[PDB]
Amino acid sequence: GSQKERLLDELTLEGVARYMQSERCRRVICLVGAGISTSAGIPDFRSPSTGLYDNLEKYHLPYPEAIFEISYFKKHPEPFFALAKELYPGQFKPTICHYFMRLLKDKGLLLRCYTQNIDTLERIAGLEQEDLVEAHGTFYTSHCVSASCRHEYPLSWMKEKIFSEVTPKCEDCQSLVKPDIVFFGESLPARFFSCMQSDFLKVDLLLVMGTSLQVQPFASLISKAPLSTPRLLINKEKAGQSDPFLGGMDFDSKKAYRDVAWLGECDQGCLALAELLGWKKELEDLVRREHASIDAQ
Amino acid sequence: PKKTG
Numbered sequence: 001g002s003q004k005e006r007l008l009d010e011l012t013l014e015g016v017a018r019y020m021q022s023e024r025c026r027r028v029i030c031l032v033g034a035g036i037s038t039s040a041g042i043p044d045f046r047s048p049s050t051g052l053y054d055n056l057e058k059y060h061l062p063y064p065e066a067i068f069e070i071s072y073f074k075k076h077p078e079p080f081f082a083l084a085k086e087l088y089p090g091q092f093k094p095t096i097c098h099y100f101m102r103l104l105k106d107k108g109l110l111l112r113c114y115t116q117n118i119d120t121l122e123r124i125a126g127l128e129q130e131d132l133v134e135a136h137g138t139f140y141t142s143h144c145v146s147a148s149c150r151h152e153y154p155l156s157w158m159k160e161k162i163f164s165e166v167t168p169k170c171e172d173c174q175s176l177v178k179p180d181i182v183f184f185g186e187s188l189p190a191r192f193f194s195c196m197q198s199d200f201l202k203v204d205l206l207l208v209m210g211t212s213l214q215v216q217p218f219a220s221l222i223s224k225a226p227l228s229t230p231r232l233l234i235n236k237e238k239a240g241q242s243d244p245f246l247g248g249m250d251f252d253s254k255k256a257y258r259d260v261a262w263l264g265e266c267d268q269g270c271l272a273l274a275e276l277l278g279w280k281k282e283l284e285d286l287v288r289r290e291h292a293s294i295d296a297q
Numbered sequence: 298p299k300k301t302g
């Protein structure tokens with residue numbers, strides 16, 4: 001129920017690793033954002049200097065978040081597709097953090113990964129449909145926007161349109177073709193809600209990586225776990241705390257009992273946790289083999 | 298619900 005029991009022996013990465021290898025920790029949920037893909041060459045929104053909010057000057061937006069809003073997209077799709085061309089990677093290589101989630105899957109620990117990312121890197125690392133909720137959709141497929149058509153197009157097709165600087169139009173009806181992303185103002189997919197309803201009844205650990213927990217309703221997922229479920233944040237800075245004026249993360253107050261912040265690069269935090277678990281060699285070998293295979297494409 | 302900032 002809603003008791004605040006303390007299941008970690010200490011509020012440290014070391015405590016989390018011990019908990020993970022106890023009989024009580026069977027079901028792990030990962031919640032991830034753009035911070036897990038910055039080291040794969042895709043900027044986030046909020047990192048100073050490198051984040052997209054500091055690099056939209058030449059688009060002359062009323063404000064930086066407009067290029068990611070559905071109202072603006074529907075009026076003028078060209079800016080978005082121009083930015084898509086600028087950001088599109090020549091190679092899709094998942095990070096150490098992505099492969100740490102692949103290990104959770106392979107060790108039988110991963111109940112679900114909920115991602116805010118649209119970059120497909122979770123799929124490339126080996127997470128399947130049983131494993132993954134793409135809360136904000138994906139670039140992997142695209143669809144015609146006309147309700148009477150809705151023809152689907154693969155990423156190879158969308159990539160060619162983006163690089164040619166031709167606004168993508170449907171071959172069957174000549175309507176706009178839109179990547180399967182959830183823009184600000186659009187509804188999330190049905191499975192986000194069905195997974196959320198089921199998964200958070202029975203979660204033993206919540207692992208939050210590379211997110212500022214500022215987009216809703218995704219950010220509210222932290223509050224859906226049972227009150228005794230430990231929560232580990234791996235991130236460059238603390239995030240998810242309740243605002244002093246406005247369930248939230250409590251790392252540091254006198255009443256802290258289950259939330260742990262490991263501050264640094266997601267890749268470094270995952271490597272550190274892997275090492276405590278006895279998984280460091282497995283993670284190293286996995287990453288090197290998968291990266292080598294990607295480099296060989 | 299909808300995606301909001």
Ligand SMILES: NC(=O)c1ccc[n+]([C@@H]2C[C@H](COP(=O)(O)OP(=O)(O)OC[C@H]3O[C@@H](n4cnc5c(N)ncnc54)[C@H](O)[C@@H]3O)[C@@H](O)[C@H]2O)c1
Nearest residue numbers: 033034035038044045046117118119210211212236265266
């Ligand atoms: N890769 C993508 O698919 C992609 C790219 C850009 C934006 N987005 C959207 C961004 C939006 C909000 O997500 P959110 O992730 O909170 O973005 P955000 O930009 O608000 O926050 C990113 C968080 O990650 C932190 N961070 C960045 N890099 C690292 C790193 N290497 N290691 C540890 N921490 C890091 C950063 O300090 C911040 O707290 C989502 O809806 C995404 O769809 C996605």
Ligand SMILES: *C(=S)CCCCCCCCCCCC
Nearest residue numbers: 068087088119136139181182
């Ligand atoms: C909600 S905040 C999603 C808006 C879409 C963000 C797009 C991120 C940049 C596109 C990078 C292309 C990767 C294939």
Ligand SMILES: [Zn+2]
Nearest residue numbers: 144149170173
């Ligand atoms: Zn069509």
